[PDB]
């Protein structure tokens, strides 16, 4: 009991600091200024002049023109002070792609009794019940009655709107003039007709002010029985590999972290081979192995994620006129997992209390004595601090230019505490009783009044120590 409690305790502490450093490094969270604003600019906008037909509450099933020629039209032609400018914070990228899942004839069998009324509506997702003929008016493939299974896309398996591997879809040009013309053609005709169950679209962004990539997916699940459900899944992904003098420190911390994980994995195998095995009913050997297993992950994920992201970002120019550039959806499928896995063990790892009792929090909440003592000091320190302020304001009021207004003497004295004295005109304004002020203020503020605070802290620590020792030795 003289080595371990002094060995893996220290090792775990250093492990804690090491992980918290690159937790800070990872903790960018620029989304609140780069994904919240991006989402508001793309999901908080009025389709009409002023109404409730926004992205929050979809307009209507027959509002194809009212919806596509709206905030969506403000994504291909974002005109501000065909264009990419909404709030001077984001730009365009890739090529737009909208999927119109039309549930055409095949919803239910049509008997000879009452098929003449209705037999083809927007039913649940299926294969032989989806779009099989023109979903309304379409001369050719405007309402394309083809299954896009070979489109290199995986179904989202949506709960509110079931997602399949097939469905009518089309892309837009490098601008919105052609996109608007196609939308108008499909509105005069019928492609997103009443049989359409849900509409899906995916998009990317550049946002050159804060260099990153944005992946956004928009889904409007207009139920056949009425209404429409909005869904917006938007998330960023950046690549900052090596340009700075701080990210190299993060890389070094990651290397140190990998060495620590190697140390803990080369240490755990011996506890099962040499030490008696199949003994995990301790709840402590349980965390030791699961933490290591999770830590092995996100190491072979981060490298793979970085490599894949770099490879994908390399080909970011050939998509100006390319047909489809919405293949990055596979990337986020990993990026969020590493965003989740990293927080599925950083708590778990910090959830280790073998070194000190968990239920002994009675000495971390009875420290209110320290808080009470710290309050009977602020009312014994501000009395002396305000008397000096008054004296300075009365003696040096008219001359110094710093002890001019009472609200300024306070800040001047605080700056004096921070070692920002001037003393060029404090003494000039009054040869005697002026330096006396400064000397006594320094002697009573740094020697006799500062140290009572440290004494209070010292006594709080000693009392906590003594109480804990008495409790644990009773």
């Amino acid at each position: 009991y003289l080595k371990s409690v002094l060995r893996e305790l220290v090792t775990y502490l250093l492990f804690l600091i090491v992980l918290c450093i690159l937790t800070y490094g990872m903790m960018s969270s620029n989304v609140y200024y780069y994904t919240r604003m991006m989402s508001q600019l793309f999901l908080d906008t009025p389709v009409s002049k002023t109404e409730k037909t926004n992205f929050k509450t979809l307009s209507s099933m027959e509002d194809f023109w009212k919806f596509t020629e709206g905030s969506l039209l403000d994504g291909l032609y974002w005109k501000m002070q065909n264009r990419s400018f909404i709030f001077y914070e984001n730009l365009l990228l890739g090529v737009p792609r909208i999927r119109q899942l039309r549930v055409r004839n095949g919803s239910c069998s049509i008997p000879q009794d009452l098929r003449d009324e209705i037999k083809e509506c927007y039913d649940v997702y299926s294969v032989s019940s989806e779009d099989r003929a023109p979903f309304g008016p379409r001369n050719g493939t405007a309402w394309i009655y083809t299954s896009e299974k070979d489109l290199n896309g995986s179904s989202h398996w949506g709960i509110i709107a079931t997602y399949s591997g097939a469905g009518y879809y089309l892309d837009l040009s490098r601008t919105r003039e052609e996109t608007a013309a196609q939308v108008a053609s499909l509105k005069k005709n019928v492609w997103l007709d009443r049989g359409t169950r849900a509409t899906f679209i995916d998009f990317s962004v550049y946002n050159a002010n804060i260099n990153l990539f944005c992946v956004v997916r928009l889904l409007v699940e207009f139920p056949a029985t009425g209404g429409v459900i909005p869904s917006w899944q938007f998330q960023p992904l950046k690549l900052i590999r090596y340009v700075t003098t701080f990210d190299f420190f993060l890389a070094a911390c990651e290397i140190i972290f990998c060495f620590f994980i190697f140390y803990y994995v080369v240490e755990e195998i011996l506890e099962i081979r040499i030490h008696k095995l199949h003994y995990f009913r301790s709840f402590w050997n349980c965390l030791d192995v699961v933490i290591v297993v999770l830590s092995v992950v996100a190491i072979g994920i981060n490298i793979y994620r970085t490599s894949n992201v770099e490879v994908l970002l390399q080909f970011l120019e050939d998509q100006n006129t390319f047909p489809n550039f919405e293949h990055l959806a596979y990337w986020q499928i990993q990026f969020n997992n590493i965003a989740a896995v990293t927080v599925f063990f950083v708590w778990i790892k910090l959830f280790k209390f073998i070194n000190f009792n968990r239920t002994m929090s009675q000495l971390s909440t009875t420290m209110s004595r320290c808080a009470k003592d710290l309050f009977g000091f602020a009312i014994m320190f501000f009395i002396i601090f305000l008397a000096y302020a008054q004296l300075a304001y009365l003696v040096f009021g008219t001359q110094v230019d710093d002890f001019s207004t009472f609200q300024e003497c306070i800040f001047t004295q605080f700056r004096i505490i921070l070692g920002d004295i001037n003393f060029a005109e404090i003494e000039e304004a009054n040869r005697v009783l002026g330096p006396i002020y400064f000397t006594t203020f320094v002697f009573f503020m740094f020697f006799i009044l500062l140290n009572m605070f440290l004494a209070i802290i010292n006594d709080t620590y000693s009392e906590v120590k003594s109480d804990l020792a008495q409790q644990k030795a009773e």
Binding site: L9, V10, L13, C20, I21, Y24, S29
Partner: protein
């Protein structure tokens, strides 16, 4: 001989205090 013993004995406490420092420091930026 005591100046080394009193520094090797108090290492866990110093590391704990530094841990408190760093966690409060990362908290200071996590509210941003």
């Amino acid at each position: 001989s005591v100046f080394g013993k009193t520094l090797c004995r108090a290492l866990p406490e110093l590391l704990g205090v530094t841990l408190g420092l760093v966690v409060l420091g990362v908290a200071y930026a996590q509210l941003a």
